[PDB]
Amino acid sequence: SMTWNEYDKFYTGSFQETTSYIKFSATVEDCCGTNYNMDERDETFLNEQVNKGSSDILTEDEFEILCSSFEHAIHERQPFLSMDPESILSFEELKPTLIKSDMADFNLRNQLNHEINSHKTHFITQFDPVSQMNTRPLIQLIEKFGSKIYDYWRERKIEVNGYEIFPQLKFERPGEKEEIDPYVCFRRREVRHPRKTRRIDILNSQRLRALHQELKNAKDLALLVAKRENVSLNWINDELKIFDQRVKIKNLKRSLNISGEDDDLINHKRKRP
């Protein structure tokens, strides 16, 4: 029993404690990244069949992005795939849906990366791991690798009879007679409450518009703070660039023994609020 030897390989990093109590409401899905995770069978295929003699490597993370888009598209277009798993759509029939797919609020993150005026790299939050930085966009991966990866994923989808590759919990089905099965769990029982009066609906409609405005005001303040920190990051990046250039100027200047023109080599105080 007791200790597992590979723990330190699987659990790395540091959680920094804050003075005030943690405030958090993001879901597990919010903090996991791409929902598809390669198993041992996936990596041997990626190592030996895809990247064996490739000039352009498909990274493990890029692979999972592709499979994740395939899963989301099939669930949208073929919800009853298990009725006839071999009738699963081809890559070309599915490609229109993959192009429009909005994975993990990508369009929202892109808009935010635009609004900040950063446009540099990608919009990074606490929910993102730093290893995900190196990945290419989905549309580019679809063109270069889409059909090849889909051929592989398609077979795995057929093997599991149109269900999930990852083992799923057994949930109750509303047409099944049922049979006292201990593996069936987490049954759902809706609230079903009577409607409010029409007047209260109108009053709550007004409260809804008011709540929308307060969220808009909050987003403006939040965007301004993000802009403030973004330009602050640009400033320290300049101070780092100015430092390296100032040292190189002086060394070359000292080599050639030139005097004067020292205005840019020192800082000048100015009227700042």
Add this chain to the structure above:
Amino acid sequence: EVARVRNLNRIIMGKYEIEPWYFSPYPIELTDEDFIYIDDFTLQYFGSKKQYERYRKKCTLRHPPGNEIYRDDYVSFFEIDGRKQRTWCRNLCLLSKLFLDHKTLYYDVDPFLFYCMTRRDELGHHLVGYFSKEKESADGYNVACILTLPQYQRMGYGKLLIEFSYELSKKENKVGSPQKPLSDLGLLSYRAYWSDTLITLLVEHQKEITIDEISSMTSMTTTDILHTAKTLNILRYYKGQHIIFLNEDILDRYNRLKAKKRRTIDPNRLIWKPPVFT
């Protein structure tokens, strides 16, 4: 029939390998695996070691998905709503069912609150135990199911869990008792807590004290108080009302108890207001 036997083989949660005791409705496909991995922060289950590795590289969560409502230098408590954190709470209930025989996973986790006790580390907050609680309990139960994880026994964690459940009830200005029939190990742990807090209250207060005044200070129901006094042989009946006194046994137990120097919940570090459900 199937539910009356151990379901899974051997499980590695975080760095510790644990041995399940009872059936749990994990995906039946996992019963064919030698090892099952449980993520130490999300409680997510894995049959494949490679999927686990990929998951750990992308998982940024390092504590229970909710607000920290208590913190001392030994443990922290997180308050998690089953309706808001469905995936995480299901994972917790699946894990808990491995070590609780009579917990039901029949319905979804929405009607429960989960108070999760953690110990902090360089890596983050590691779940060591928890207790669930109905958002609205008809019988006034302040605990539904309560569990200390097997790898964290012999650390006094169970006592802290029980203390914290009553500290919430005291802040709620309610009396409370654990749900319905208690497990054998659960019944043992509550009787120990009930005796300890009763003898501690009686000795330190010194004066005579009413049943209702004891119920007011500890949030223990009169039922639990009376039964605790009967076991300690310090309850008597006079003029239609029950009375608790002190003897040589209670003063002796108190000295032994105070010598133990156990870890305790500090109510001043509980920053928490009762959730309001419409």
Add this chain to the structure above:
Amino acid sequence: MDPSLVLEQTIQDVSNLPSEFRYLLEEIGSNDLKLIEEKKKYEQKESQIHKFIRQQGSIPKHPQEDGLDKEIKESLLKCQSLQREKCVLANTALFLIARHLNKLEKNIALLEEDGVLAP
């Protein structure tokens, strides 16, 4: 479509948001305080280099130029680290509110497509 239901769901969804904004903003504030103290630490050393240049120029080397330059780059580098953290923190706050706002705007749109909510 039920506006009272949409309002109840939105209020529940956004219940913990003001607490998260305060929590994130004070971690930004606590980092900016550490950033300023580190700014003084490298600006004072950069002032010595600048004081020497005003008197003797850039051709003569400061008596401790190699030692100060290494200390300035070091302090400048941990400022960049602190500033990156504030950027990440500010991005999460913006991301949280932006995601709640889009969900509300989709709900408002669904209510407007019916006669239920007036545009």
Add this chain to the structure above:
Amino acid sequence: SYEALKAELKKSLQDRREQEDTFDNLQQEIYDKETEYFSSGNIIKGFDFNNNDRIFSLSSATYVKQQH
């Protein structure tokens, strides 16, 4: 070689100047928006004024220094 480094150092000095000015605007903009929007449901108060309720400006230690 030397001429190029002095030309791109003036370029990065101008960048620092521009970042410093837009930073000063954002600080003032944030303070004005705190006033306009927050003077029922609030991101400050709960969704269900005071100078200490300026949690956005108070995130800057530059504004904290000015107020003190």
